[PDB]
């Protein structure tokens, strides 16, 4: 199977910039390379086929180039409608294979998260489960790390998180992490903390509470 690699999975840009997205094939594909755009609502469009032919309906600010193994899509001047994810695809040999995708986002200044911790409600605890929530509000860039600790034990495998799409007004992200324990485990411990690492914080920020206080 030909392996297509888009080694940047996330690419920051400003409106009006020239942007270039790179793809490379694990072996020669003889110019049988498509570029696709997938918008935030999930709609997929062909942009460029056969390396550099512009698909009908696509503006000429998109262009493609390359050969053998190495290929690029260039957007000459980024518009807001161009913030999307781009995938390459080779159709030289079956099975046709796609790159992993490059998602564009808008560059802004580094902004540290506001962090908040939320104990489980007494209502939830009646049902036998405790969810502890950590909120990281309005930060940039997207990369952030949350570590949960219960009485100084690092928790691993018993949390899930999710992240908002880049905000249209302030170009930030927010993230919500939930730690799930049985009520019986929750009541055996005292100190619940979430420790947040982010480029905007000179050292990690811990928010914590003591159960039943």
């Amino acid at each position: 199977d030909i392996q297509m690699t888009q080694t940047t999975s996330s690419l920051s840009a400003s409106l009006g910039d020239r942007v270039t997205i790179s793809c490379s094939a694990s072996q020669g594909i003889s110019n049988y390379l498509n570029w696709f755009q997938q918008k935030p609502d999930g709609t997929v469009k062909l942009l460029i086929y056969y390396t550099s032919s512009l698909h009908s309906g696509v503006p000429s600010r998109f262009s493609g180039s390359g050969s053998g193994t190495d290929y690029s899509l260039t957007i000459s001047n980024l518009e807001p409608e161009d913030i999307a994810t781009y995938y390459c695809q080779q159709y030289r040999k079956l099975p046709y294979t796609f790159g992993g995708g490059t998602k564009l986002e808008i560059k802004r200044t580094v902004a540290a998260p506001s962090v908040f911790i939320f104990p489980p409600s007494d209502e939830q605890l009646k049902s036998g489960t405790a969810s502890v929530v950590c909120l990281l509000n309005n930060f940039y860039p997207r990369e952030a790390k949350v570590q949960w600790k219960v009485d100084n034990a690092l928790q691993s495998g018993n949390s899930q998180e999710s992240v908002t799409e880049q905000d249209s007004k302030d170009s930030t992200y927010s993230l919500s992490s939930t730690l799930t324990l049985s009520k019986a485990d929750y009541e055996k411990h005292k100190v619940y903390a979430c420790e947040v690492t982010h480029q905007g914080l000179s050292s990690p920020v811990t928010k914590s509470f003591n159960r039943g206080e």
């Binding site: 498509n34 696709f36 997938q38 999930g42 709609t43 997929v44 469009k45 062909l46 086929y49 698909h55 009908s56 995938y87 695809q89 159709y91 079956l94 099975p95 046709y96 294979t97 796609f98 790159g99 992993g100 995708g101 506001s114 908040f116 939320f118 489980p120 409600s121 209502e123 939830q124 049902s127 969810s131 929530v133 909120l135 509000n137 899930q160 998180e161 999710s162 992240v163 908002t164 927010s174 993230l175 919500s176 939930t178 799930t180």
Partner: protein, 206 residues
């Protein structure tokens, strides 16, 4: 205008079967090779297969060649995909394409054992302040959340759901508000889970 309209997606138990369709219009369907592509939640595009105009060549991605059957009916301007022995890994949005130039909007397959269930809504109480609602243990997607029946929109973030290991989803919605408003202003999250016909209004306070 070339148009490709998919249908037939839904919930299916593991080991079940489903046939999805793609109705073409605005071009001569009998003249084109057609493709199927899929995309798992939060993942990339994956090619499934192609069929030529007279169905004498049908090519599959080798990992799916026993699971899936592509066909077409030129007189009906429809392309089909038959899925069998579906598993969790088949959960995805399925797109048809005329060559790779024109794409359908997608139809979604969710492969799961879980039954339809409305959410429990729990407070994320405040103590700038943040507060919220935890919307826990529902199936299937989607749920919607508003604040104050839609009068409160600024500072709200409603997060994507996470699929828990139970097979049920959980999401949070949060809002940042002035600390001074907390004694005086009412905050209610309005949750609507259309697939179970469940509506909940949860008042959140300190």
């Amino acid at each position: 205008e070339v148009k490709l309209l998919e249908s037939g997606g839904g919930l299916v138990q593991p080991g079940g079967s489903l046939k999805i369709s793609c109705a073409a219009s605005g071009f001569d369907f009998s003249r084109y090779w057609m493709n199927w592509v899929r995309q798992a939640p939060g993942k990339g595009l994956e090619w499934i297969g192609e069929i030529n105009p007279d169905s004498s060549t049908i090519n599959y991605t080798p990992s799916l060649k026993d699971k899936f059957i592509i066909s077409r009916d030129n007189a009906k301007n429809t392309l089909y995909l038959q899925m069998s022995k579906v598993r969790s890994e088949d959960t995805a949005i399925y797109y048809c394409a005329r060559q790779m130039g024109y794409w359908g909007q997608g139809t979604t397959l969710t492969v799961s054992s879980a039954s339809t269930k409305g959410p429990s809504v729990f407070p994320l109480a405040p103590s700038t302040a943040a507060l919220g609602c935890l919307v826990k243990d529902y199936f299937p997607e989607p749920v919607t959340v508003s604040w104050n029946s839609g009068a409160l929109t600024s500072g709200v973030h409603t997060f994507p759901a996470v699929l828990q290991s139970s097979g049920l989803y959980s999401l949070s919605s949060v809002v940042t508000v002035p600390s001074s408003s907390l004694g005086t202003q009412t905050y209610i999250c309005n949750v609507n889970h259309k697939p179970s016909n469940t509506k909940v209004d949860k008042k959140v306070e300190p």
